[PDB]
């Protein structure tokens, strides 16, 4: 899983969000993006991942916000089994400011998805002056 979208029309009628990450960078954009019905970064061949078809929007209009920064903890390629990563995010907008909180936990060893009876505080990631209206969201996964 890579990122999310946030908007109100999602079809180039109004501006919307784009949250994306790539290895050693993260891009946040607010723009009039024409979100195609198949935004993806996975279907490239049978069982391997390439990065093509990244630009799922054909309207590079006046993007009202661009931001490039440091990404989070990741791993290379993909291996099935012995999963241990527990990633946790929460997103909230208020007064025209978008806010993110994040936390990761290792060694989630149990195979059945019990989601064990654990607890942990969530720390703020960064504020953003989004200044736009949002009504719906959809996840962009590779």
């Amino acid at each position: 899983i890579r990122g999310w979208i946030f908007g109100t029309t999602l079809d180039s009628k109004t501006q919307s969000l784009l949250i994306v990450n790539n290895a050693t960078n993260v891009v946040i954009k607010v723009c009039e993006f024409q979100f195609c019905n198949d935004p993806f970064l996975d279907h490239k061949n049978n069982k391997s991942w390439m990065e093509s078809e990244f630009r799922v929007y054909s309207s590079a209009n006046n993007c009202t916000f661009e931001y490039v920064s440091q990404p989070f903890l990741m791993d290379l390629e993909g291996k099935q089994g012995n999963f241990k990563n527990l990633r946790e995010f929460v997103f909230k907008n208020i007064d025209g400011y978008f806010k993110i909180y994040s936390k990761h936990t290792p060694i989630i060893v149990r195979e059945p998805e019990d989601l064990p009876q654990g607890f942990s505080a969530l720390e703020p990631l960064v504020d953003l002056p989004i200044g736009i209206n949002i009504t719906r969201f959809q996840t962009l996964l590779a």
């Binding site: 009628k13 109004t14 007064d95 025209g96 400011y97 200044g131 209206n133």
Partner: protein, 49 residues
């Protein structure tokens, strides 16, 4: 300017009270009338800004 400066705009029609601290770029037909007004102007068809 005495000849007038025509690079300024302002909204007139909106059926929703916008929240504090946000923009709104949408220029859509205000359907205060009861007809599917796409139109250009006229009865129950007015420019937004």
């Amino acid at each position: 300017k005495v000849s007038g400066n025509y690079n300024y705009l302002y909204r007139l029609f909106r059926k929703s009270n916008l929240k504090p601290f946000e923009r709104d770029i949408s220029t859509e037909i205000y359907q205060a009338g009861n007809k599917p007004c796409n139109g250009v102007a006229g009865f129950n068809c007015y420019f937004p800004l």
